Amino acid sequence: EQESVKEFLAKAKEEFLKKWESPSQNTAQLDHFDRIKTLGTGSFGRVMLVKHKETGNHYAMKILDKQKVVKLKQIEHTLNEKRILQAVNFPFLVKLEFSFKDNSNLYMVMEYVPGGEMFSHLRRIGRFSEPHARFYAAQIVLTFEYLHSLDLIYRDLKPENLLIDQQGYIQVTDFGFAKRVKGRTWTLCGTPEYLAPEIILSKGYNKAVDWWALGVLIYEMAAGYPPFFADQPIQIYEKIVSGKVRFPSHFSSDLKDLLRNLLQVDLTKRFGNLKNGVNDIKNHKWFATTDWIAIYQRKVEAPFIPKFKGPGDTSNFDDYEEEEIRVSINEKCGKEFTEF
Ligand SMILES: Nc1nc([C@H]2CC(=O)OC23CCCCC3)cs1
């Protein structure tokens, strides 16, 4: 590896480890913010656009209901998410500004990226050209190079988690499945279309699952649909484990070759998991036109700038029923979330 990359990654790991070992806690409180709009809602949490009442800055506040986190067996995952996010620093990761908890909820106050999910833009236009897909893919390659060097596995790569920023670059959101792993881990998590075979088969798995998911993402960006598509999860899983993939004729030969090596069912043969690591990907012919440094430095003009009116515009996100942020008069699940 170029000594330049080695020294960059050594510093990145030093800085991560200092914050990892001494995490920040309790750096804001709920009544510092006004609520604007619900941007997403799930079985144990929500993301809400908020505005800081003193600075006027907008943020995407992730609110997790402690009781539901416990019921759905997400305790460790929520602790992972916050501890990791407060310790990382990379251009293509949404930044965690503040975190805190109260009697009912956990809060992660993230920068608000107003351009919408990649998923929305992909579905709007149908499919991305290869250069357009490659620009986003290159950012994910660099992001995974960074995360994996810190012993982090991301485990939730999918188009909904890639937000398009004011410069047209991606920022990855939702670290709910991210984990610091030396060696193997076992939890079943991730969206069906993106799961690596070794997850489906209940094996001890490693960072190679992220590289598999990159193959799925690149395929979906370039085709408009994912490679193992089927109507129900069990049918998806049968296709994933089969070792067969079909490519649209419009794909270039270089794209097909890269994808066969990312979508390799034998994890010991999968690009990103061989002796040369990420460099088998970065040096592949499909990436021959990619200026990795210029991407990292945000010096490349992006494929498109999302249409939005300002840092508070929510037009690129969807509409959800607006529910209370109620805080119990009694502390819930205090022991479980002590470290948050
Ligand atoms: N020569 C150098 N390259 C960098 C960048 C850009 C790149 O290709 O990889 C880095 C370092 C490793 C993590 C991802 C970002 C920094 S110094």
Curated annotation (Swiss-Prot):
It catalyses: L-seryl-[protein] + ATP = O-phospho-L-seryl-[protein] + ADP + H(+); L-threonyl-[protein] + ATP = O-phospho-L-threonyl-[protein] + ADP + H(+). The modification Phosphotyrosine is found at residue 320. Disulfide bonds: none annotated. It is an enzyme of class 2 (transferase). Residues 33-287 form the Protein kinase domain. Allosterically activated by various compounds, including ATP. Activated by cAMP; the nucleotide acts as a dynamic and allosteric activator by coupling the two lobes of apo PKA, enhancing the enzyme dynamics synchronously and priming it for catalysis. SMART domains: S_TK_X, S_TKc. The modification Phosphothreonine is found at residues 38, 185, 187. The active site is at 156 (proton acceptor). It comes from the Eukaryota. The modification Phosphoserine is found at residues 129, 328. Ubiquitously expressed in mammalian tissues. One of its GO terms (cellular component) is sperm flagellum. It is a lipid-anchor. Gene3D superfamilies: Phosphorylase Kinase, domain 1, Transferase(Phosphotransferase) domain 1. Its main location: cytoplasm. One of its GO terms (biological process) is mesoderm formation. Belongs to the protein kinase superfamily. AGC Ser/Thr protein kinase family. cAMP subfamily. A number of inactive tetrameric holoenzymes are produced by the combination of homo- or heterodimers of the different regulatory subunits associated with two catalytic subunits. cAMP causes the dissociation of the inactive holoenzyme into a dimer of regulatory subunits bound to four cAMP and two free monomeric catalytic subunits. Activates cAMP-sensitive PKAI and PKAII holoenzymes by interacting with regulatory subunit (R) of PKA, PRKAR1A/PKR1 and PRKAR2A/PKR2, respectively. Interacts with NFKB1, NFKB2 and NFKBIA in platelets; these interactions are disrupted by thrombin and collagen. This is cAMP-dependent protein kinase catalytic subunit alpha. The gene is PRKACA.
